[PDB]
Nucleic acid binder design. Structure first.
Length: 49
DNA sequence: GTACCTACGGCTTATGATTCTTCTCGCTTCCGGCGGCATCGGGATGCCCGCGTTGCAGGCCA
């Protein structure tokens, strides 16, 4: 549900590509932080296979 | 239409403070350095013969 309980939001997306490993992100929490380099799609598919 | 502040977190870059390490001085005293004498073990020479050295040829090695 949305902020006022009037709409619906999908929890996760039915994706086919691991965008976390392909592009990544760089965010910082209140006490934590993360940083992930991008990668190549073909080698990720090869590793998954 | 046209810019100006910090919060949340991680790696660097610039500068001062601190302790570790090393450079340098301190005169003195004790360990050593040095001159002299009696001494005690040593070198060279006399001599001989037997072992060390060497010439020649044979078989073996790199």
């Amino acid at each position: 549900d949305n902020y006022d309980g009037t709409e619906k939001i999908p929890d996760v997306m039915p994706t086919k590509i691991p965008n976390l490993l392909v592009n990544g992100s760089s965010g910082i929490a209140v006490g934590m932080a993360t940083n992930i380099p991008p990668h190549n799609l073909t080698e990720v598919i090869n590793g998954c296979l």
